[PDB]
């Protein structure tokens, strides 16, 4: 029975590891890659222009062991910007494989 405090500690560790990776990983081959980023939910690598990018369900989720095959998706546009949801600047994301 997974508690809030356990989940916060795992999230902090996921964030810490993500931030190290963002800092440490070498720069993309061109500025047309979408920028790696931690969006509070998942750690995203650089994205090739015109491509979908996927990462595994974030491991700190309370139900992570119930979604061991799932992935979350972004789309990197040809201009090096993550695709945005309309009438906002929030990124488009498909998290449906990582729901409870």
């Amino acid at each position: 029975t997974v508690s809030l405090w356990e989940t916060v500690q795992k999230w902090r560790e996921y964030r810490r590891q993500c931030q190290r990776s963002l800092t440490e990983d070498p720069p993309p081959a061109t500025d047309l890659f979408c920028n790696r980023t931690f969006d509070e939910y998942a750690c995203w690598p650089d994205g090739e222009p015109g491509s979908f990018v996927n990462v595994s369900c974030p491991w700190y989720l309370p139900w992570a062991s119930s979604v061991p095959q799932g992935h979350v998706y972004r789309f990197c546009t040809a201009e090096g910007l993550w695709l945005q949801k309309d009438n906002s600047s929030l990124p488009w994301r498909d998290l449906s494989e990582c729901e409870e």
């Binding site: 997974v2 508690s3 809030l4 356990e6 989940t7 969006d39 509070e40 939910y41 309370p62």
Partner: peptide
């Protein structure tokens, strides 16, 4: 013996919900 019909289920559900609402807070922004 009915699952979800006991006070222990309600208390476990409430604690699980604290963590799930934290997740939903992270997803939003």
């Amino acid at each position: 013996h009915x699952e979800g019909x006991f006070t222990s289920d309600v208390s476990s559900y409430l604690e699980g919900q604290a963590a799930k609402e934290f997740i939903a807070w992270l997803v939003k922004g």
